[PDB]
């Protein structure tokens, strides 16, 4: 019916980028660069948050089938955001995205677009649609983070601090391969799980089963704690690596 868009962590060592000589650190860097590029460009254009993530997920899935060396990262990222705009019904003209790209890219980085930046992007749309198998509908952990928080009852200010901090973790998780590792529902629970430990919150108390120590089960079934700890470990790797500190 629908294609599978999820791999295992061990499979990332065999991406077309890895197999062409790129080291694991460079592909992860190229992914964060492309993710933040799609994030910053669409933010400058005033785009909805679902449109940003949809293009980022298109971007992440694209370089599971192709190599970063053969397709320029910033040329591909612009095409994903352009397609994501028409997909999520928040469209922008291709010339408007190119204009924003020149603002945020230096002379070296913008050279990927070649002599005709618009044509290099419009051309890549055919390969993008074929690579993503025309599976345009993509859901994101944001709607699940909100669907689960409404079922929480208690201190409104404590729950609101939990949501924004988890929402920050979802924005940061876009820079990672987590979008490909796990379904969006599990990611929304893991960011609740991480923000609960940092904020010292007992999330089980706000649920309909205040005693259910596995508070996550009432939201997403069949989720071991090993997965939640694994996702939390990946998100916090960005904070310790970069210059940003944990929200807390």
């Amino acid at each position: 019916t629908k294609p599978c868009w999820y791999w295992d962590k061990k499979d990332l060592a065999h991406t077309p980028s890895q197999l062409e000589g790129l080291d694991p650190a460079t592909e992860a860097r190229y992914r964060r660069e492309g993710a933040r590029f799609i994030f910053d460009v669409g933010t400058r254009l005033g785009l909805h948050y679902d449109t940003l993530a949809t293009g980022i997920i298109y971007f992440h899935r694209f370089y599971m089938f192709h190599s970063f060396k053969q397709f320029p990262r910033y040329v591909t990222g612009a095409c994903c955001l352009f397609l994501a705009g028409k997909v999520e019904e928040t469209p922008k003209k291709c010339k408007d995205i190119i204009k924003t790209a020149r603002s945020l890219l230096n002379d070296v980085q913008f050279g990927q677009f070649g002599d005709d930046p618009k044509e290099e992007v419009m051309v890549l749309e055919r390969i993008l649609l074929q690579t993503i198998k025309f599976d345009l509908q993509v859901e994101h952990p944001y709607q699940f983070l909100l669907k689960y928080a409404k079922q929480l009852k208690g201190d409104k200010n404590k729950i609101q601090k939990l949501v924004q901090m988890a929402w920050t973790f979802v924005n940061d998780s876009l820079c990672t391969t987590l979008s490909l590792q796990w379904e969006p529902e599990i990611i929304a629970v893991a960011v609740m799980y991480l923000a609960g430990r940092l904020c010292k919150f007992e999330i089980q108390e706000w649920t309909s089963k205040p005693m259910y120590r596995r508070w996550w089960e009432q939201f997403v079934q069949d989720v071991p704690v090993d997965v939640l700890e694994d996702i939390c470990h990946q998100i916090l790797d960005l904070y310790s690596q970069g210059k940003q500190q944990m929200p807390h």
């Binding site: 791999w7 499979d11 990332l12 060592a13 065999h14 991406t15 077309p16 197999l19 062409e20 000589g21 080291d23 694991p24 599971m64 089938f65 192709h66 190599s67």
Partner: protein, 826 residues
């Protein structure tokens, strides 16, 4: 009964080992490079290497180590050959005459013992107290380094652990201590023992055994400052010393297997590592020193420096240069820079040493109708794969055509002014479900390209499952121009299809000249391939067209043109196809009495079959009946590597034990049993692994008939890059040249005092026989280098066949003319 003559045209070029030390003098830093049976002595300078001496040894150099005992001015050299000849050598220079002195010599072969799996290992104690040899399973041989042990006598200490992977003499131990990784059914472990020359037995080792990686490869003796050892594996590098245990597991080294190592800093702070993909790593040893009372290892680090040639041995010299000794490609001198280049690599190549590497196939072609002839070889493997064009140069001129993939078989088609080359590249299962190549090669960078659209195997109910990270071989047929050597076209065969044989010829009454490839469907579940294709191509107007396909039930290991019919070997079957007027192949007759019909040669209606076992078979196509007929077979079992037809009665073959032999039909006897018995009449230990025999010669060919002492010309290429020549002699010339060998052997002093007859003696693990029917031409051509007093010793009492019908004694100058005429065959 048969008489042959073998000379070396090109010395072995593949570097089998390389070491750094102080052999010539205590001040100079020498780089002793070891190729097969050859020892090169160089002097390291600021500009590169300065040659000083090159010597030949009567044995395949297996172990080569430099040591300096107490009281010696410069380092001495210890060498153990493949035939277990051990010796200790010293450098002596009297002005311009440089000679190598054999201080000690002996044979350390045991009468009873199972040869180990990981090969001969040679280690020397840091205190130079003993030489440690691992020659057999469960046995550790110790040669005590006493000043009077000139015969190199040795005793064996029983070893509990039978299956050992690698062993080294440890540093920083009170008593001489060995550290080894062994493999038992409980995995692999590392253990230690103390060697006692007084007791001649093992004592308990310093630190205990621990369970290590299942693919533990090498042991690295960390020097005195850090102490202990480092164990290299496939995914983890571990350091063990006393109670200290360290384990690093970087994700980069999992991609390719590490095979070699070398120390940069003598204190052991920095180490070199190399992969199968040419990647170069650096192993860093962090120090924790506090008034020197600790100097323990804080942590270990590995960093990727760049890409070198696939090296068998690495050695760091001085001024930042490293010699990359390669067996699969060209050896190089590389510069290690502190600065990364524009690509992020810290390695820059200084010089390139041409290495013919593995010569898998080769063909002699007179491209320029000069009468000289050129040899185009398939050389190298993986990234070092290339084509080499060799010609006589008025030394030798070799042109390299890099392919960046493994070449397989080569054939020339003058009708298209191009070559046919079978090649294979390695791609890895990516995340998209398909495969992605690591590097571009000739099959991908072809001008035009095509892929076989055959459905001959249809679904063959075999949709094997592929997991991510599994290597796959992609076989292609390359069309290469004869002038530019540009990849004109590349035909990619079916999935999981290996290209094994390649021929260019016309068939039947069809005037078009075709390229024919024999293939096989290779799956890991199959012990012997049960599917295959014989496909016929026609190269016309720069594009290859699929003419016809024939399905076979096995592997097409070899094909050859037989009187306009195609003779092909399919697994145990040797089949003859006919080229019908419908442009399709049709089976005529079969032969089945084989195990694995590998190498094929034909001459008229005669057929020489080279099987995996037992040896060589003669098949004759009988046109009256239309079926094959066995004439005679060599009944002594041999593992064949290449066969060749010398004449209608002599046959030449090469076995996996580095031995050449010559069979002959028992004349035309009256008994049916005598005729059917191919008798081995020639035996000779070559020392090289022959892959391809080829008729031809690179010397100028004079259509004028000249009564030359040699008749015929057969060239062969080897794994170590050595190219030789085989030719037949008359009985008068054989006895004349053979008598010179016995005179030359008594005169010439060999390195390590190795008997020449012992070296050239036919040698397998089970039988050892003296050489017969072969004249070591490398020994005969050395007559032009011995001093004049030694020439008179050779020509003394020697009776020649001067003129016509007279047995007059030869002058020494008469022998110089004979050898100089034999030097003109190459």
């Amino acid at each position: 009964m048969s008489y042959n003559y073998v000379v070396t045209a090109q010395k072995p070029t593949a570097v089998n080992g390389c070491v750094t030390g102080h052999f010539t003098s205590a001040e100079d830093l020498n780089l002793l490079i070891a190729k097969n049976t050859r020892l090169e002595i160089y002097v390291v300078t600021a500009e590169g290497l300065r040659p000083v001496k090159e010597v030949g040894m009567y044995g395949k150099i297996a172990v080569m180590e430099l040591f300096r005992p107490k009281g010696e001015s410069k380092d001495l050299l210890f060498i153990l050959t493949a035939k277990y000849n051990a010796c200790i050598l010293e450098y002596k220079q009297s002005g311009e005459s440089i000679d190598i002195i054999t201080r000690a010599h002996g044979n350390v072969q045991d009468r009873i013992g199972r040869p180990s799996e990981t090969g001969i290992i040679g280690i020397i104690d840091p205190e130079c107290r003993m030489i440690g040899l691992r020659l057999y399973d469960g046995l550790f041989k110790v040669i005590p380094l006493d000043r009077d042990n000139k015969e190199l006598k040795a005793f064996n200490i029983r070893l509990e652990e039978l299956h050992v992977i690698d062993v080294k003499f440890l540093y920083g131990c009170q008593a001489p201590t060995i550290c080894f990784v062994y493999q038992d059914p409980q995995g692999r472990h590392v253990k230690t023992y103390e060697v006692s020359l007084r007791e001649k037995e093992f004592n308990k080792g310093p630190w205990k055994q621990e369970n290590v990686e299942a693919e533990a490869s090498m042991v690295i003796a960390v020097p005195e400052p850090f102490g202990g050892a480092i164990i290299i594996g496939q995914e983890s590098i571990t350091y063990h010393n006393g109670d200290k245990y360290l384990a690093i597991a970087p994700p980069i080294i999992k991609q390719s297997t590490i095979v070699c190592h070398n120390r940069v800093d003598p204190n052991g702070s920095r180490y070199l590592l190399g992969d199968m993909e040419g990647r170069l790593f650096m192993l860093l040893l962090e120090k924790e020193e506090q008034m020197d009372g600790t100097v323990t290892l804080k942590d270990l680090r590995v960093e990727l420096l760049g890409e070198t040639s696939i090296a068998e041995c690495l050695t760091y010299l001085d001024n930042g240069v490293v010699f990359v000794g390669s067996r699969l490609g060209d050896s190089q001198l590389v510069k290690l820079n502190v600065d990364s280049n524009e690509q992020g690599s810290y390695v820059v190549a200084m010089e390139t040493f041409t290495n013919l590497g593995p010569i898998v196939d080769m063909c002699v072609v007179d491209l320029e109708r000069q009468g000289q002839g050129q040899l185009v070889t398939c050389s190298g493997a993986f990234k070092e794969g290339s084509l080499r064009i060799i010609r006589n140069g008025i030394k030798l001129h070799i042109r390299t055509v890099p392919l960046y993939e493994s070449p397989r078989k080569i054939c020339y088609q003058e009708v298209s002014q191009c070559f046919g080359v079978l090649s294979s590249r390695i791609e890895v299962q990516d995340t998209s479900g398909g495969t992605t190549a690591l590097r571009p090669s000739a099959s991908t960078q072809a001008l035009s390209s095509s892929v076989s659209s055959s459905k001959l195997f249809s679904s063959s109910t075999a949709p094997h499952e592929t997991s991510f990270g599994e290597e796959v071989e992609v076989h292609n047929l390359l069309i290469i121009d004869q002038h530019t050597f540009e990849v004109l076209h590349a035909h990619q065969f079916l999935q999981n299809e290996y290209a094994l044989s390649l021929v260019s010829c016309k068939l039947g009454k069809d005037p078009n000249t075709y390229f024919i490839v024999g293939t096989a469907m290779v799956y890991p579940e199959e012990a012997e391939p049960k599917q295959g294709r014989i496909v016929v191509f026609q190269y016309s107007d720069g594009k290859l067209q699929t003419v016809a396909e024939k399905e076979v039930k096995g592997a097409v290991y070899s094909m050859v043109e037989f009187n306009g019919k195609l003779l092909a070997s399919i697994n145990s079957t040797v089949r003859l196809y006919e080229w019908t007027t419908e442009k399709e192949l049709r089976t005529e007759c079969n032969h089945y009495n084989n195990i694995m019909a590998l190498y094929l040669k034909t001459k008229g209606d005669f057929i020489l079959v080279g099987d995996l076992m037992r040896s060589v078979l003669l098949l004759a196509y009988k046109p009256m009946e239309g079926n094959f007929e066995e004439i005679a077979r060599d009944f002594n079992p041999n593992w064949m590597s290449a066969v060749e037809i010398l004449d209608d009665d002599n046959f030449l073959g090469a076995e996996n034990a580095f031995n050449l032999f010559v069979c002959q039909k028992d004349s035309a006897a009256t008994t049916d049993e005598e005729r059917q018995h191919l008798q081995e009449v020639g035996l000779f230990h070559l020392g090289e692994f022959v892959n391809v025999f080829c008729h031809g010669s690179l010397v100028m060919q004079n259509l004028g008939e000249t009564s030359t002492p040699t008749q015929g010309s057969v060239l062969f290429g080897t794994v170590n890059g050595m190219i030789g020549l085989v030719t037949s002699l008359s009985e008068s010339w054989y006895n004349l040249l053979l008598d010179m060998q016995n005179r030359l052997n008594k005169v010439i002093k060999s390195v390590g005092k190795i008997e020449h007859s012992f070296w050239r003696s036919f040698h397998t693990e089970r039988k050892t026989e003296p050489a017969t029917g072969f004249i070591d031409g490398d020994l005969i051509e050395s007559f032009l280098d011995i001093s004049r007093p030694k020439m008179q010793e050779v020509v003394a009492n020697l009776q020649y066949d001067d003129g016509s019908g007279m047995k007059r004694e030869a002058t020494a100058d008469d022998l110089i003319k004979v050898v100089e005429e034999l030097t003109r065959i190459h």
